[PDB]
Amino acid sequence: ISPIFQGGSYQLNNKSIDISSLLLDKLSGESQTVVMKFKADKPNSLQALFGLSNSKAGFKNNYFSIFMRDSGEIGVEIRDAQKGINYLFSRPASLWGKHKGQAVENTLVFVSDSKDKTYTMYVNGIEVFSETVDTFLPISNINGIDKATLGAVNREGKEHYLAKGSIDEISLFNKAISDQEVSTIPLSNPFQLIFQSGDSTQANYFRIPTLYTLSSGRVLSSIDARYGGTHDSKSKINIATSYSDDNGKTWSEPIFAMKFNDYEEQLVYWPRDNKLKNSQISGSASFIDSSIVEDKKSGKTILLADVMPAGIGNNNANKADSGFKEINGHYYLKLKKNGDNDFRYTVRENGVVYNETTNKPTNYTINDKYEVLEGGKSLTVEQYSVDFDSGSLRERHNGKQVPMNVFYKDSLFKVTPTNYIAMTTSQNRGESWEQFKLLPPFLGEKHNGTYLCPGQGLALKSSNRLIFATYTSGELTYLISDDSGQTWKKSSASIPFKNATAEAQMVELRDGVIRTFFRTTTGKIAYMTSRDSGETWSKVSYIDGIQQTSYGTQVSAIKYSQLIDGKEAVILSTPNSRSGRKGGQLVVGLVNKEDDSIDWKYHYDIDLPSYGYAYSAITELPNHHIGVLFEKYDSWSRNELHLSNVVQYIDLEINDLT
């Protein structure tokens, strides 16, 4: 249907605009839709875009507003004192501010539906909240409403929540338009989604993006598909992948590179209230932190991720145990049988489960999928599903049987409760992935394994060498293969922090010269250099000119193929901020051929300094554009947990950055 009101080209410069005469007497019925296209690249701390209010003395809490914060949060208030109603619905990190230095036109759709008693907010094609209430309050049913305002709320005759920005278009409808109708509304998005709520992964949440340009020109991406909110394990998380064959313009429906079946893949709205937001799927196995590389020699794509058995995160991860037993230069996966207090088994050659106390083999074997077989027959366990129907999180059997896996809670044989690294490969550039294999321990039998650095591995240009950075307490532990990832060795490089989350990414400055940039606990990004293709590593230095928080954030980095200002160039992606994960930048550095030092010459602001930017992935697209897939929110903040569709993709050109 048609708008009852339509206006545009409104400039909000800290002075409200009264549209009462134009709008108020057009409002009728109990259901309304607001469609508003607006820019705000210099927002005030807290500002209202739109208000309906009782402006009379004594009725300061009788109003409806659509408001935003300079954090990028969007919300509404719906208030009527006489009715005793004070609704406040919102979601952090819902907005864009700037893109390529130009103010972004956000498309906001707010639906107030009296029939379903539900308020729903979409921004830029993304539903950011949908709230059902017992007692519905139609927005124009507020006692004594006498003002319709743009860029403030009129309370007791004064302008509250004064806005800075513009409303290029605003329409109102005396109808609650359908989800279908919403999706036909044209958008002006500066970004794309590769992974998103409702896709093939059926995860409502995603974290830890990666990007990698394959030699055929295909761009591949991997990500944590996170089911139990945005929590790091413990949770259910699979590793999903998608690829683009047209320079990032479009992307394939995701598939899984690594998945477990002990818990159902469920699209779940995770509670965001302070009482329940720390609810955590607690009995599921999971993957976390993926990294990609391509091997010139075989042509295979190789993906690694951390693996966690059921219940297990990095907090309850058995340090002081690798999960393997050393038996004469060889490492065998340890197992514990249902009922025993110790790990009395190992998985020897051909997956034969072997009793260590009597040195007899059992009739149990472990297949290539880490599934348990008895006498060649597939054992099963019953799957779990989760729900908050009772009010709190419940994890319960759902009737479906799935293959018994040693990483599962209900398994007859269980691996050691600690962190492992798995590897899978693709022969068809990400169209399918093999069953993963665990990597062996590198730091000894009684050292719990290292943590994979998410993002990219490094494929050295002039050899067959493959390297994946990993971290542990007191060092970076590079994993090195010269035979297409069939065998790996480690190269240890000491760093001056104990228990840092030293997420590290590498660039090749020139043949055999690797610089690694990594996250620290110092508020500055660090780096070290190898000049022998990763055999040995320099001492640690720090970058000036970029700030991180004390706890730090992952940094992504590439070596750009083309000269810039006549020099070799490296591009870093990172939040630039000592307060939180915001102020995203790409920083372009020019290499000094004399000494391999880097002049950080250009800083490109991804969006506003106050808007969220966390983990990121950068790649040089085959057309020499830059692709960026990143968490567009603060993934540290306890106020921004469990947000949907915040991992977003943008395309940039080098001239945009300079």
Ligand SMILES: O=S(=O)(O)CCNCc1cccc(Cl)c1
């Ligand atoms: O800096 S963040 O807190 O946003 C993400 C830190 N992830 C570290 C990790 C790695 C492997 C397993 C687990 Cl459980 C946690």
